[PDB]
Design a protein around this ligand. Structure first.
Ligand SMILES: O=C(O)CNC(=O)c1ncc(-c2cccc(Cl)c2)cc1O
Ligand SMILES: O=C(O)CNC(=O)c1ncc(-c2cccc(Cl)c2)cc1O
Ligand SMILES: [Zn+2]
Ligand SMILES: [Zn+2]
Lengths: 339, 339
């Protein structure tokens, strides 16, 4: 199944999307549940750190009127990070780690520009039917214009603050605004914080994998610039290098305006703006996970084993004085001894 | 080369041993230098933590008269640990770690007995030409008889205490008495302390490998009872499991009465009592290595990387709550990511 039958928009406006707008992949999926925020099952899913789509939170209700016109006239004159790409895949590159791998070629290039400059490129590209793609990813702070501040104040802080308290999460670390073009793909990766993914404009297909599928998704080394992302090309998986990708099973859903997807900490997510669906707008909310208990029940959670692996890789990097010696030492430790 | 031409005993007594008494192995070797304790080159070798045979230390001069008769009549009535074996290989088993591996079969069995009982078995075995083998390995403390205490006090403590101070080593941790039968083999292993190997009776072939040949020698897992020993059977090496054993290069020498072999910390050693050479007697001295400097020069020593690997394996054992999960997690961390 996976995404399921497309939903019918109110007023008999027809289906919001069709299967032809979803890309084709090699793995099966099951659907993420779409529930009401008042449904106790949704409460149980979040508490158990499983994904759920909430349909009626009103989390970003005032932002549902947002489009390029409204934002350009009200966002203000500030710098917005804009990422470029020659293809549909926007692989992230941590610039601080580029020193560790010298012969690493970045595929996407970040650019700072005012918002009207961002709209111009989209208009310019659209005019000449170019194959270039863009993706705006900028934090929203107090600098933005007055009208956008009013909208932000109109978010449902009552609800999201309640969730913060119920789950004992830490503080809201950041709120990121995402504006992308149709067809854009953010490849599979995991984050170390709890995420509420608030869709505003357009539709996004979200494919999630639990932390226990670490073995099938082959993240980059911790010291690599692409740390936390899968090495597997979902469009052309190299089964000789990544054989357990043939065993991957995902959770998917299509989110539209007004939906909020809970992406639990350490869960992989692969996100694409539907083909031929126009631009997409999203706001993300990240919260630090709850602290680790004093006494651990044992039979450790998958995310706890991922955290251990990350720490091993980090400690060796420092202890050996060079991140490039991590791989050779780990292989020495394993070959003919644990494998 | 390796052992080199056998030495000529004084008084034209002929060669002390011949090549026919050495076992045959698949790897090459170079000779350990035999030097005088007054030779500054020997001082440089110890300081640089490289093996050397010292010919004239008088370290255990009073013990050179030791044999089974003398010891039985003077050692006293105490318990001596005696290890048994069905073959010539005496693989060590840490009894405290046997819990971690349940389906582990021990090949040697320890036995407590008085010294005259130990001589009786050697006499009994010799009588019936049995294939069983024995090895006495007991610490020497103040309980032993008066004459043996006098001999121990007659060791060259002036010299060995000077070495302790020069190298900044820690305290003498223990002194072990080793009495074995001809043909006995102590398989390749490394220790975490500095060792002075004082040969008393008979001849032993010592084959040493530097710490940087860790990759070729495939030690057991840290939590295995045979921790610190090589998995490779030197008599029948399994090159499919242990391919880099085909690249091993060793340092060897034959030690006789009055020789002292410095075995540096973390150096592998394989030790065999020569075939048809009678019983062998040895006393070992272990000293804690010097402390780790505050500021490390970097480009780390091979023994420092071994220590890191040991600590990783130990930390994971505790962190995961089960030593048997160490291997699976390490493979998960490496497969398709670092290998
Ligand atoms: O939502 C999408 O459509 C795709 N984007 C992400 O998934 C994402 N994930 C994480 C981050 C991020 C960036 C910086 C810090 C932190 Cl804690 C998180 C940004 C991100 O854009
Ligand atoms: O010398 C031989 O002929 C073979 N024996 C060893 O190599 C040896 N090595 C280490 C120990 C040992 C046993 C207990 C504690 C410590 Cl620190 C060391 C005993 C040992 O017997
Ligand atoms: Zn993310
Ligand atoms: Zn030893």
């Amino acid at each position: 199944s996976g995404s399921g039958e497309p939903r019918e928009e109110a007023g008999a406006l027809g289906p919001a999307w069709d299967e032809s707008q979803l890309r084709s992949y090699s793995f099966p999926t099951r659907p993420i549940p779409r529930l009401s925020q008042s449904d106790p099952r949704a409460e149980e899913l979040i508490e158990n750190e499983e994904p759920v789509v909430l349909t009626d939170t009103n989390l970003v209700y005032p932002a549902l009127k947002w489009d390029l016109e409204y934002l350009q006239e009200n966002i203000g004159n500030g710098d917005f990070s804009v990422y470029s790409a020659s293809t549909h895949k926007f692989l992230y590159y941590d610039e601080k780690k580029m020193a560790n791998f010298q012969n690493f070629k970045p595929r996407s290039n970040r650019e700072e520009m005012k918002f009207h400059e961002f709209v111009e490129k989209l208009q310019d590209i659209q005019q000449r039917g170019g194959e270039e793609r863009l993706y705006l990813q900028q934090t929203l702070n107090d600098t933005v214009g007055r009208k956008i501040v009013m909208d932000f104040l109109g978010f449902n802080w009552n609800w999201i603050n309640k969730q913060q308290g119920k789950r004992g999460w830490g503080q809201l670390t950041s709120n990121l605004l995402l504006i992308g073009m149709e067809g854009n793909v953010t490849p599979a990766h995991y984050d170390e914080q709890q995420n509420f993914f608030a869709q505003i404009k357009g539709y996004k297909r979200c494919i999630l994998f639990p932390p226990d599928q670490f073995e099938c998704l082959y993240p980059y080394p911790v010291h690599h610039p692409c740390d936390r992302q899968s090495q597997v090309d979902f469009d052309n998986p190299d089964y000789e290098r990544f054989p357990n990708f043939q065993n991957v099973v995902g959770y998917e859903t299509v989110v539209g305006p007004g939906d909020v997807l809970y992406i639990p900490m350490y869960w992989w997510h692969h996100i694409e703006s539907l083909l031929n669906g126009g631009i997409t707008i999203t706001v993300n909310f990240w919260y630090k996970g709850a602290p680790t208990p004093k006494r651990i029940e044992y039979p450790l959670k998958a995310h706890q084993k991922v955290a251990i692996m990350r720490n091993i890789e980090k400690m060796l990097g420092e202890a050996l004085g060079n991140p490039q010696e991590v791989g050779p030492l780990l292989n020495t430790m394993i070959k003919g001894r644990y494998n």
